[PDB]
Amino acid sequence: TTPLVHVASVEKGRSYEDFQKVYNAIALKLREDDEYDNYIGYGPVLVRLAWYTSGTWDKHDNTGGSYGGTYRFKKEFNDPSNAGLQNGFKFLEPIHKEFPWISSGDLFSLGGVTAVQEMQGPKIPWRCGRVDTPEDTTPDNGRLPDADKDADYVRTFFQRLNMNDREVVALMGAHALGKTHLKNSGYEGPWGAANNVFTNEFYLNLLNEDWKLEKNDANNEQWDSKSGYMMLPTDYSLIQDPKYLSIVKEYANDQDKFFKDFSKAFEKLLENGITFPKDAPSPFIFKTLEEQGL
Ligand code: HEM
Numbered sequence: 001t002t003p004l005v006h007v008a009s010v011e012k013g014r015s016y017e018d019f020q021k022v023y024n025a026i027a028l029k030l031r032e033d034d035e036y037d038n039y040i041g042y043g044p045v046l047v048r049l050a051w052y053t054s055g056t057w058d059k060h061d062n063t064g065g066s067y068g069g070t071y072r073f074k075k076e077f078n079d080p081s082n083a084g085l086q087n088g089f090k091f092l093e094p095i096h097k098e099f100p101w102i103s104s105g106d107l108f109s110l111g112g113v114t115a116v117q118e119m120q121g122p123k124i125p126w127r128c129g130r131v132d133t134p135e136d137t138t139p140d141n142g143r144l145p146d147a148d149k150d151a152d153y154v155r156t157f158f159q160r161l162n163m164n165d166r167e168v169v170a171l172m173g174a175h176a177l178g179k180t181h182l183k184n185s186g187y188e189g190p191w192g193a194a195n196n197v198f199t200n201e202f203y204l205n206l207l208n209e210d211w212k213l214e215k216n217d218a219n220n221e222q223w224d225s226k227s228g229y230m231m232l233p234t235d236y237s238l239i240q241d242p243k244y245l246s247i248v249k250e251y252a253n254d255q256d257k258f259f260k261d262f263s264k265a266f267e268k269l270l271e272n273g274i275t276f277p278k279d280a281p282s283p284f285i286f287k288t289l290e291e292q293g294l
Contacts, residue, residue: 004136006067008129008276011101016284019110019128022099023286024294026114029095031289037178040195042091043115044178049088050112050270051174053105056143057272059162064143065273068133069104074141081144084184105130109270116266117288119177121198122259125267125283127276147187147232148220151241154234161272163265169238169247170261171269176202180230186218189230203252205229206239 011018029042036042053071056064073079077086092111096102102110106128113124145157158168176199180187192201209225216222223231238244251258267283 001061003062006062006065006131006274008127008274008280009131010129010281011103011106014101014128016281018099019102019106019126019284020286022095022102022107022110023114024289024292025095025098026092026111027118027289028294029091030115030118033091036087040178042088043119043196045084045088046091046111046115047174047177049085049092050109050115051171052082052085052140052144053108054269054272055145055161056138056140058143058160059272060160062273064138066105066109066270067130067274068136068138069106069108069130070133070137072137072139074139080184080186082140084181103128103130103132105132112266112270113286116174116198117286119196119198122263123285124263125285127271127274127280127283129276129280130274145234147185147234149234149237151237151244154237155241161269163269165243166247166261167265167268169244169251170258170265172235172238173200173202173251173258173262174198174266175232175235176200180222180232182216182218186216186220187222187230187232188216188218189222189224189228191231191235192229193227200251200255200258202235203248203258206231206235206248207252211236 034041054066056071058064073082073085077083088111092107096107110126113126116124154168163171175191178195179190182188192205194201209227209229211223211225211231213221214224221233223236238248
C-alpha cells in the first residue's frame with residue numbers, strides 16, 4: 001500500500017486552554033492515585049505507554065506511530081512485550097470520559113508528556129491534531145524492541161524510528177522511571193532509587209554501580225547491583241558500545257544537557273509520522289500543577 005500521509009487536524013474549536021485542562025486532569029489523577037505499584041504511582045507506566053504506542057512507527061511506510069491512536073496488542077496484554085500497559089490505558093479511561101473530544105492519540109501522548117513534567121522532568125513541547133483511525137489498526141506484534149539484545153540490535157532497531165545514537169541514549173534515560181516487573185516482562189527490579197522523579201540517574205547508575213550478570217526468577221539474564229538496581233541487556237549495551245558510552249558519560253555529567261536532548265527526542269518520537277500544516281498552532285508548553293499553584 002502506498003505510504004499514507006497523516007495531517008494533524010486540531011480538534012474542532014479546541015485551543016491551548018482546553019489541552020491544559022486535560023493535562024491538569026491527568027496530573028491531578030497522578031497525584032490522587034498515589035498507591036499504584038507500591039507507591040511508585042502511574043507516572044512511569046504512562047511514559048512507557050506513550051513510548052510504546054509511538055514506538056510502533058515505521059519510517060519506511062509510515063505505519064504505526066501515535067497518529068491513529070488505534071492499536072491491537074498481542075495476546076491482549078498477555079505477552080512479555082506489552083504486559084502492564086493495560087494499567088496506563090485504565091488510568092486514562094476516566095480522563096477520556098471527562099474530555100471525550102480529545103483524540104486517543106493526543107491523549108496517549110499527552111499522558112506521557114504530563115507524567116514526565118509532573119515528575120520534575122523537562123518541559124516537553126506537545127502538539128495536538130492526531131486523528132483516530134478506527135479503520136486503520138496497528139498491531140504491536142514484533143514492532144517494539146526485545147530487551148535481551150546487544151548494542152548493534154539497539155542501534156539498528158532505532159533506525160526504524162529515525163533516531164540516531166544521541167537520540168537513542170537520551171530516550172533510554174527514561175528508564176530512571178519505574179521498574180521491570182517479573183510477571184510482566186520476565187525482568188525484575190528498578191533501574192534506580194528515585195523510581196518516580198525524572199533525573200539523569202539512569203546514566204549515573206550505569207557508570208557508578210558494580211554490576212553482575214545473573215539469571216532472574218524467570219531464567220532471563222539481567223545486570224544486578226548490590227544497591228538493588230538492575231539493567232536490561234539493552235540498557236547495559238549502552239556502556240559496552242564505545243559510541244554509546246561517550247554519550248552516557250555526557251548525560252551522567254550534565255543534567256541540563258540530558259533534559260534538553262530528552263525533550264527534543266521525546267517530542268520527535270511522539271510526532272513521528274505526523275505532518276503539521278504551516279498554519280498549525282505552535283507547540284504547546286504546559287504549565288505543571290506546581291507552576292499553576294494547583
Ligand atoms: C531498547 C529499548 C527499550 C527496551 C528493550 C525496553 C524494555 C522495557 C521493559 C522490558 C520494561 C519493563 C516492563 C515491565 O516489566 O513492566 C520497560 C519499562 C519501561 N520503559 Fe522501556 N524499553 C526500551 C525503551 C524505552 C524508551 C525509549 C522509553 C521511553 C522514552 C521507555 C520507558 C519505559 C518506562 C518509563 C518503563 C517503566 C514502566 C513501569 O514502571 O511500569 N522504554 N521497558
